[PDB]
Amino acid sequence: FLILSRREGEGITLSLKADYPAEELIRQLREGGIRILVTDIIGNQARVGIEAPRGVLIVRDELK
Amino acid sequence: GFLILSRREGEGITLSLKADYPAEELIRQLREGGIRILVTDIIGNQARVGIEAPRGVLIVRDELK
RNA sequence: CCCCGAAGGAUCGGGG
RNA sequence: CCCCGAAGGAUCGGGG
């Protein structure tokens, strides 16, 4: 699980790591799947959790 | 053009890839689009969440099985 | 409730 | 600010 705070209007982008083997990934999902939990909301700040095979990159949008 | 659904503290979303979509085809769609996650709005107890993703992926609120 | 941070895979960290 | 919906790909619909 990875945890980041977003406000209204802020996003999160899920590329997939360039290196990892193509087929490799696909099974982990057909089995695993990606999990998006909204672990706690407070005032203006949503606090999200993301759980994803290690071949997916997760970046807050403001990281280019 | 993405998918909108409200969640509360502790509520989730699970992203499946449709069982019929080809293995090799999906990859193409992420390689060129990624999957995006906007928090469109926050109001009180409920978070409003936008998710943009290739028809290859099934977006379901965690409480539908 | 604010504020600030977070290249972080952790249900993140720090301040009023 | 609440309520309740939402198998829905649409920055979702309904009531105070």
Residue numbers in the entry:
A (entry chain A): 3 to 66
B (entry chain B): 2 to 66
Quote the study's own text:
Through phenotypic complementation of an rsmA mutant in Pseudomonas aeruginosa, we discovered a family member, termed RsmN. The overall β sheet structure required for RNA recognition is, however, preserved with compensatory sequence and structure differences, allowing the RsmN dimer to target binding motifs in both structured hairpin loops and flexible disordered RNAs.
To elucidate the molecular details of the interaction, we solved the structure at 3.2 Å resolution of the RsmN dimer complex with two 16-mer RsmZ regulatory sRNA hairpins. The asymmetric unit contains an RsmN dimer with residues 3-66 of the 71 residue construct observed in the electron density. Sequence-specific recognition of the 5′-AAGGAU binding motif of RsmZ-2 is facilitated by positioning the consensus ANGGA motif within the flexible hairpin loop. Hydrogen bonding between the bases of G8 (N2) and G9 (O6 and N7) positions the “GG” motif in an orientation that presents the Watson-Crick edges of the two purines for a set of base-specific intermolecular hydrogen bonds through residues in strand β5 and the adjacent loop primarily through the amide groups in the polypeptide backbone. Ile60 forms multidentate contacts with both G8 and G9, supported by other specific CO or NH interactions from Ala54, Val58, and Arg62. Base-specific recognition is also evident for the two adenines within the consensus binding motif (A6 and A10 in RsmZ-2), which are positioned directly above the G5-C12 base pair at the end of the double-stranded stem region. At the C terminus, where the RsmA orthologs have a short α helix, RsmN has a shallow hydrophobic patch involving Leu59, Val61, and Leu65, which binds A7 nonspecifically in an analogous fashion to the corresponding C9 of hcnA (Schubert et al., 2007).
